[PDB]
Amino acid sequence: SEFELRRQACGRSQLLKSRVDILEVARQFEMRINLDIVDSMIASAIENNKVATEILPFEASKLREIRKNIDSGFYTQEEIEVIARSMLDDVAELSSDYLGNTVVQKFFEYCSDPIKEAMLERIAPYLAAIGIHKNGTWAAQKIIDVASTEKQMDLIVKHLRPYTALLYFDQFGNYVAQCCLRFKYPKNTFLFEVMARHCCEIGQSRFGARAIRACLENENATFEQQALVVASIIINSHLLATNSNGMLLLTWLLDNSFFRNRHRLLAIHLATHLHTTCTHKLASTLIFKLINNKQEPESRNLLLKNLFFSEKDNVLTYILQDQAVGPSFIHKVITYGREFLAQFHLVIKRVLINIHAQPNAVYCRLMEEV
Template identity: 20%
Template sequence: MFLFSVDQHGNQFIQQKLEHCSIEAKESVFKEVVPHASKLMTDVFGNYVIQKFFEHGSPQQRKELADKLVGQMLPLSLQMYGCRVIQKAFELIELDQKTQLVLELDGYVMRCVRDQNGNHVIQKCVECVPTEKIQFIISAFRGHVAMLSTHPCGCRVIQRVLEHCSNQLQCQCIMDEILESACALAQDQYGNYVTQHVLERGQPHERSQIISKLTGKLVQMSQHKYASNVVEKCLEYCNTAERELLIEEIIGQNRRK
């Protein structure tokens, strides 16, 4: 079954069968697969079989597979196929296992965030684990939010934090660092997405702070490759009074020219 799982066509056959086969047949396959689970998780084809068991296996089978992640969270998070298995597991396993597993990443958060594979795991942790269980992740970002917002992987993680963080104090610390650097972020290739995210989903007073930072520079920003997208979002999401001021600045400066 191991050789079948790491073969492209055999792998597809197993995946299809797991969706519809009997409980007995599934258990028979599981018994053959589980001793090789660690190797399959990092295999180009085998990882899909493990993901299918997380999706269609019994609660006990999910638990046994999740136990195979213990002690392996960091290397799997940084591995191309292992990171996908972890993401699928975190969508489906019980909270107590998620909480146990996520703690293995304590001390390695920034390494994962900057990694093309690991950042997806951190995003999934933020999405699927309650904020009070992953405070070490949010704390790791303190003082580094602007830098992470300008990183191709980090900017995605910061956006997930803004969406899912339920600890008002910690979330405010993240937001304060974004607002402090709003002007620089608006002009950055990746940071502009974080600024747009706040304009779309943030509180009115947070939008107002961003608009205040951009005031006096709107024409310059409107001509900038990345900041122009932020100015568009300002006009779309600001209140009527703010919109009038923004338009007046843009038109007024153009008239003076």
């Protein structure tokens, strides 16, 4: 699957490793986030290990008349329910039918809850498969959108949870996932558990990253749910910054977010990954945004210490030994003080000597600046 490929390129979940670091970041937001709620979600995130590999899956005239008579008000609610109960053996197959999907929709709009629960009991094991179907997705979102009882939501949550990651990857399934935000806490929690645990894999997909943004901006996400996923975004920022989709989440985090200390906490974490981020074409752009920001001095200060005044200049050496990104980054960073500027000038000159750096197109500007 696409999940298998990104799971291989992400390693073990940062939520598994840094359960205590995530709890601290959520605490260190200074937003009064209840840690017991956050930890229990990390608990249920680790508890629920069922993760799916793939998603596994009455002629035209007769269906049209059913839909025609329902739209015409020609039916009683009890008359619709007799029809529905007589099609339970087929209602799952119909949910993906180009005509059946419109009928199953009408069935859920008008039947009473016990019949909706009877239909859903036959559909639930296929809801994720219907959810990614071009036709079926209209029925699956309608089913979730009209889920009114507790028995209905639990059935949807139970049979969607193993496929929640795979849904975020899908052009239609990620909207099906978002439909579950209606359930509110605690039923919609499974969405944020999956987003936090697989923030690396989901964040690197074209749809999942955009669906994460949507979930975090949703009015039914509690602060704790937001804090859990955002903290996961932060401790994965060194991985998300390496591709455009992950960068979208980080861009969203810096700009369109109300989280206090997000800039500082993001910089603090990225300071231990300066060699890889500042040598990557896209990640270096973010590292510069964190330093160039004048209103975040603690970030720029900690980022500059780890950048130039390192254990043995190994951080600065790695960056300047890179060809396509490294030296351009360091030259920029400095060319935007005067006493402080010469102090950085001193450290750059030492590394370029030990690099044996030639003054070709890579080192023209930087060698002149120091």
